[PDB]
Design a binder for these strands. Structure first.
Lengths: 205, 50, 151, 262
RNA sequence: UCGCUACUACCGAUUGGAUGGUUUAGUGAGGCCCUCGGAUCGGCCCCGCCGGGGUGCCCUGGCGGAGCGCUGA
RNA sequence: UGGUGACUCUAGAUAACCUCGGGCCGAUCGCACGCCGGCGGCGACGACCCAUUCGAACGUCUGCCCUAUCAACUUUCGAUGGUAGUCGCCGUGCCUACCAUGGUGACCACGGGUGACGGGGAAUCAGGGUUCGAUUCCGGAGAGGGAGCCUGAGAAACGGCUACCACAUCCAAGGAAGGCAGCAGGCGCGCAAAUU
RNA sequence: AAACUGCGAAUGGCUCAUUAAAUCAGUUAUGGUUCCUUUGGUCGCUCGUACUUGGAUAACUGUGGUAAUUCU
């Protein structure tokens, strides 16, 4: 069927070859898994040597890493935005590797607030909840509060990251091939890479 | 149209040769595995369902 | 940005650029640590690769390629297509009925890294064998030596 | 071919097997095993062709299925089993022990050893790596995986293995001044002392070896098997003692023998 | 030169026929992949006939009926 | 920790993940019978992984007959390269999107022909040379012609399946079944080749 | 005997149509891949009815269909 042979092409000089054998099985290709957004659907494929691949057809959640903080968590993928390969893959909402997607932020917002004991992502409207205040303002012993206070000196986040935490969704890049391993893992964008990706999203509008 | 009839609670079996049109009307326009009260098959089939 | 002329952000995969250290580090200087390797068969890594800022993954010193196989040499003939060059190898073939030779040549396409700047089409280049980098490219430039009209 | 091959033609068999042209069309294809197909002696060509304990290939099977032959301490009932260099063959019924050692002509010799010498073998080192939880692992020329070895043992060395337990009892490093045998190429079966090793990075090394009579030759580093430390071998040697005679010397030594007879 | 005999190669109106190979456009079997679909086959529930044990309740065994119940193939 | 000429290698640490079309962590079998109700000795069959053997698959450098009454060829429909991805066992225009305009050629490219499978080799022979190699060994290809698949470690398998094209078999006319370039054998073709 | 299960049937044998840097030969590389089987290692490393678990289906018995098949 779909083949990945080299003898159907032209020679370097531009000359047409003549094949000497027919299509073999070590040369085959398979249809693409255009992984969409939805509740999980995965089909197993038997591959050379008797092994298996995982064609993910729909994905809803994935493992994503906040690299600066070293915080990797499961998070619900929301929406598909600018794609570096094809801008047609964004209208159909297709997940592939090195794609720019939106993810939820609450698993990260909980770890930051439970580790630095500071409120991040709270809007300026005085949103206080007894569970949240027990997370934040619970009274610790002398040594525990000392260890928390010596930690607040470097508990600072950039201005581009904290804006996203206001709207509850972060921007992430999927570093895994979802149509080969069946899962969408990746890293949240930061720094100059986030600066670069925020320009070309605005340049598409 | 002959009928293979088996009674699973005893194990007895026989083929009955039927050349009538009224008995086959009930079985017509029906699918497999449909339990239907075949009462027109004979006098002993009054309470039998197949 | 000159370094960022493509649709996808260009970086060295081994290097992590988002180490949140301190406000002073932001104040001090923003220069990324660079990944360079020692492609080694007696060859030396040019200093334009340790101090450069180009991003190319098919470079031997600062990319993901391994040099193994044959070490060859040639003369640069054409520099026209992006980031790769065409070189010429001239040899003598022996015809034994006449006990004589004849000149033959081969044209070979090699990959040129940005660490090798100021190279013109007259000069001798050493090339090392690597994995298939494209349809008709299997070698990579390892050393550049100026031609007869050396300045 | 759509898969692996299962036959071997007699003219395509390794020449040192010494197979004649007109016995058959086929030769025993060695089973997969610790030794390579072209560097091994199958059990049938040793029991039938060399020792002549059997006249046909059906008789080799009758000897094997009685569980009489042990290859390095284990009974093998496969009649095409790939025995090879430094292996020990034990027949307990007749009380015989043999070691597979090349002779000067490049062919495996019928070298009988004592029951004490059959308790160990010498193995080259092919690979050293570290496995999970930091455990060092060896791989030898006999396809033996031996873990927790000494850290002084490196690749191209030789170790001594006790065949009952399979553990290292001693080792010899690779260095100039050590005895060795050539196990391939054009000097196969020759014994001499290492004198030099020239290194060619990115390619094959070359080792220079000098005989006891003063003849010097060279081989590739992969064809060198360190036998003993210094001039003293660690195993018993065949009749020729590893010295390659010239054709004229061999002719004179053969002619002198028949004059002695009378 | 003119006259008589034979055979080859060529031109040639007939937009010659036979055989085979290339392609434009359209149609297009069959397998494979994806999205649906759901003939049938169970299980856990609900009632009816009912034994045992523990203590009106639960665990059970033969089941029959039926419910736009849920779940699986 | 260890090693390479050279790792983005092996080993290590940390935060998580772990596919229901699902990942390993033994409800299997035989023979001898025993020691102090417990403990057990030889094997057989299975197991993710690592290494090894048998390979296979992709690439590197050099090398082939005649032909110019074939001198320019490739690039719309991937041609040379770049970036990101899809697919693939993997490296790669293998394929897609966006870019750049490249790549080969009288040192004979491109096209055509071959009574062209390629070597190890054979005949002739002062020395040089000329011609042959379908043929029992090694490699390739095919199973009437194309194409597509299932199973499996491995096949685009044909003494497997599914279609189409060409032939052809039995029939109650509804249907069913095909593949000798395997060993014999028959027809045909021929100057030309053996026993069902 | 039969039948279920496992393995093999991808080797061998034949032929030379295709095929002109293609095939192939010497030389190299996989640090760019897979590998049934043989041989060796591993197989209480995991802190969460077991003195044995569940439902079928062949062979067999019985009733059959078709002009016809290694059909069912």
């Amino acid at each position: 069927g779909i083949s990945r042979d080299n003898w159907h092409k032209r020679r370097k000089t531009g000359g047409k070859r003549k094949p000497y054998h027919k299509k073999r099985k070590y040369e085959l290709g398979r249809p693409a898994a255009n992984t969409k957004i939805g509740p999980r659907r995965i089909h197993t494929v038997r591959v050379r040597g008797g092994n298996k691949k995982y064609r993910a057809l729909r994905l809803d959640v994935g493992n994503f890493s906040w690299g600066s903080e070293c915080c990797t968590r499961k998070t619900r993928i929301i929406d598909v935005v600018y794609n570096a390969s094809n801008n047609e893959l964004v209208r159909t909402k297709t997940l592939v590797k090195n794609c720019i997607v939106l993810i939820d932020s609450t698993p990260y917002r909980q770890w930051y607030e439970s580790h630095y004991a500071l409120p991040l992502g709270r809007k300026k409207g005085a949103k206080l909840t007894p569970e949240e205040e027990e997370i934040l303002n619970k009274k610790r012993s002398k040594k525990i509060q000392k260890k928390y206070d010596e930690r607040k000196k470097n508990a600072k986040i950039s201005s581009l990251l904290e804006e996203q935490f206001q709207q509850g969704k972060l921007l992430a890049c999927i570093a895994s091939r979802p149509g080969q391993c069946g899962r969408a893992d990746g890293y949240v964008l930061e720094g100059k890479e986030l600066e670069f990706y925020l320009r070309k999203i605005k340049a598409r509008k | 149209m002959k009928l293979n009839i088996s009674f699973p609670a005893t194990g007895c079996q026989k083929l009955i040769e039927v050349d009538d049109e009224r008995k086959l009307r009930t079985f017509y326009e029906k699918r497999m595995a449909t339990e239907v009260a075949a009462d027109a098959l004979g006098e002993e089939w009054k309470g039998y369902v197949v | 940005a000159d370094i960022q002329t493509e649709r996808a952000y260009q970086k060295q995969p081994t290097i992590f650029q988002n180490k949140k250290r301190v406000l002073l580090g932001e104040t001090g200087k923003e220069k990324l640590p660079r990944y360079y390797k020692n492609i080694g068969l007696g060859f030396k890594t040019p200093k334009e690769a340790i101090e450069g800022t180009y991003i190319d993954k098919k470079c031997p010193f600062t990319g993901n390629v391994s040099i193994r196989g044959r070490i060859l040499s040639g003369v640069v003939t054409k520099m026209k297509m992006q980031r790769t060059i065409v070189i010429r190898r001239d040899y003598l073939h022996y015809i034994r009925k006449y006990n004589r030779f004849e000149k033959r040549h081969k044209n070979m396409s090699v990959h040129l890294s940005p660490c090798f700047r100021d190279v013109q089409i007259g000069d001798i280049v050493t090339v090392g064998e690597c994995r298939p980098l494209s349809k008709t490219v299997r070698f990579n430039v390892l050393k550049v030596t100026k031609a007869a009209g050396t300045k | 071919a759509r898969g692996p091959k299962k036959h071997l033609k007699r003219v395509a068999a390794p020449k040192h097997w010494m197979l004649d042209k007109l016995t058959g069309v086929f030769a025993p294809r060695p089973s997969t095993g610790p030794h390579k197909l072209r560097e091994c002696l199958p059990l049938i060509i040793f029991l039938r062709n060399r020792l002549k304990y059997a006249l046909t290939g059906d008789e080799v099977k009758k000897i094997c299925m009685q569980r009489f032959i042990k290859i390095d301490g284990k009974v093998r009932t496969d009649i095409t089993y790939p025995a090879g260099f430094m292996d020990v063959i034990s027949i307990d019924k007749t009380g015989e022990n043999f070691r597979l050692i090349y002779d000067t002509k490049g062919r495996f010799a019928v070298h009988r050893i004592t029951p004490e010498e059959a308790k160990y073998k010498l193995c080259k080192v092919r690979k050293i790596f570290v496995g999970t939880k930091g455990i060092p692992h060896l791989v030898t020329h006999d396809a033996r995986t031996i873990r927790y070895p000494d850290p002084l043992i490196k690749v191209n060395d030789t170790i001594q293995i006790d065949l009952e337990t399979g553990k290292i009892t001693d080792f010899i490093k690779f260095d100039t001044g050590n005895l060795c045998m050539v196990t391939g190429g054009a000097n196969l079966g020759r014994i001499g002392v290492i004198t030099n090793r020239e290194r060619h990075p990115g390619s094959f090394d070359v080792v220079h070896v000098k005989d006891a009579n003063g003849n010097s030759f060279a081989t590739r580093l992969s064809n060198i098997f360190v036998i003993g430390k210094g001039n003293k071998p660690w195993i018993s040697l065949p009749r020729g003692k590893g010295i390659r005679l010239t054709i004229a010397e061999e002719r004179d030594k053969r002619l002198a023998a028949k004059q002695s007879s009378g």
